[PDB]
């Protein structure tokens, strides 16, 4: 069945709020979240509901935008790079599990293109 979702808080990790982290939530995450293709990426993959018996045999580092959103809201990220890495992991997992030309892969591709355009404008 499904694993616990990724951690979204770490009480032993200090917290800080920077312009880059704020931009990642209010601009990058929010724009992708509202995209027409966002829903499959808004929460952890549910292999039980979707009937994907080998998903968590193939994907050992799951990631999703619901987790990313909560991490940003909880100030889980100290470095902007941590958040960028999570988005990258989310897209890469989709490309690993699925096949070229699948609907979900085309959706990931569109979201990744938009992600790159938005992180291009990340403030200094």
Residue numbers in the entry: 43 to 166
Paper text:
Reduction of c-Myc levels has been demonstrated following treatment with degraders independently targeting both CBP/EP30026−31 and BRD4.32−42 Here, we pursued a strategy of targeting c-Myc through dual degradation of both CBP/EP300 and BRD4, via the small-molecule inhibitor ISOX-DUAL 1(43).
Cocrystal structures of the first bromodomain of BRD4 (BRD4 BD1) and CBP bromodomains in complex with 2(43,45) revealed two potential solvent-facing vectors for linker attachment: the phenolic ether and morpholine groups. We proceeded to synthesize a small panel of candidate degraders based on this exit vector strategy, using 5 as a key intermediate. Routine cyclization chemistry, involving the ester-acid lithium salt 11, led to the important precursor 12, which underwent amide couplings with a small range of amine-linker-E3 ligase analogues to afford candidate degraders 13–16. Good balances of affinity were observed for degraders 13, 14, and 16, albeit with a marked increase in CBP IC50 values, whereas compound 15 was less active toward both bromodomains. Degrader 14 bound with a similar pose to the parent scaffold BDOIA383, with the isoxazole oxygen forming the typical hydrogen bond with the highly conserved Asn140 at the bottom of the binding site, and the benzimidazole moiety packing between Pro82 in the WPF shelf and Leu92. The linker-thalidomide portion protruded into the solvent and was not resolved in the crystal structure.
